[PDB]
Amino acid sequence: SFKEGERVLAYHGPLLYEAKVQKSENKEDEWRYHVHYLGWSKSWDEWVTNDRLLKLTDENIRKQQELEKSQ
Amino acid sequence: SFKEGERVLAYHGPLLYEAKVQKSENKEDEWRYHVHYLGWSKSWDEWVTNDRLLKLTDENIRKQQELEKSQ
């Protein structure tokens, strides 16, 4: 699971954006994460589930790049 | 982390009692567990943190036994 302060990749629409986890919570055997999209307004901060996020690894950054290159 | 429905050992005072996890929640990087002590009044159902609980393993059951014998 993702930790508070952790930088991640996050979908917002079909592209991946760098984000930071502000809060992590689990109820009913499900994680939710309140994320801030880096360089975006705080108005876009929101709760998301695991399926919206990727660990900030070079492997997942390559996924970000592939999506950028295929437009 | 313990799961809903899981039987555990729980301190209530210095002895260990079998209990069941009713609900598990995590906030601020901390699990809490709402437990029912088996055979006890529902009045005693309560939220506890990890320090109050032990996995139902043979080693921890042996700890329960040791505490009973040193009573």
Author numbering:
A (entry chain B), B (entry chain A): 10 to 80
List sentences from the manuscript.
MRG family proteins contain a chromodomain at the N-terminal and an MRG domain at the C-terminal end. As a “Royal Family” member, the N-terminal chromodomain functions as a histone reader that specifically recognizes methylated histone markers. MRG2 and MRG702 have been reported to be involved in floral transition, a highly regulated process in plant development between the vegetative stage and reproductive stage. Herein, we study the binding specificities of the chromodomains of MRG701 (the homologue of MRG702 in rice) and MRG1 (the homologue of MRG2 in Arabidopsis). Both the MRG701 chromodomain (MRG701CD) and the MRG1 chromodomain (MRG1CD) specifically bind to H3K36me3 and H3K4me3.
Only MRG701CD in complex with H3K36me3 produced crystals that diffracted to 1.4-Å. There are two MRG701CD molecules (molA and molB) in one asymmetric unit (AU), and the r.m.s.d. between these two molecules is 0.140 Å. The structure of MRG701CD adopts a compact fold with four β-strands shaped like a β-barrel and a C-terminal α-helix. The trimethylated lysine binding pocket was formed by the following five aromatic residues: H37, Y42, Y62, W65, and W69. However, no extra electron density was observed in the trimethylated lysine binding pocket. Comparing the structure with other MRG chromodomain structures, we found that W65 in the aromatic cage was stretched toward the center of the cage. The indole ring of W65 occupied the binding site of the trimethyl group in the lysine side chain. Two MRG701CD molecules are related via pseudo-2-fold symmetry in the crystal structure, and they form a dimer interface along the β2-strand of each molecule in an anti-parallel manner. Specifically, both E50 and K52 on β2 of molA form both hydrogen bonding and electrostatic interactions with K52’ and E50’ on β2’ of molB, respectively. In addition, W56 on β3 of molA contacts W56’ on β3’ of molB via π-π stacking interaction.
